C-alpha cells in the first residue's frame, strides 16, 4: 500500500516546488 502512498509523497512534492517558481 505504503507503495502507492509513497508515489503521493514525492509527487506532491514536486507540485509545491513546481509552485514555487515566480
Not at 1 to 18: E, K, M, N, P
Amino acid at each position: 500500500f505504503i507503495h502507492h502512498i509513497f508515489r503521493g509523497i514525492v509527487h506532491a512534492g514536486r507540485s509545491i516546488g513546481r509552485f514555487l517558481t515566480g
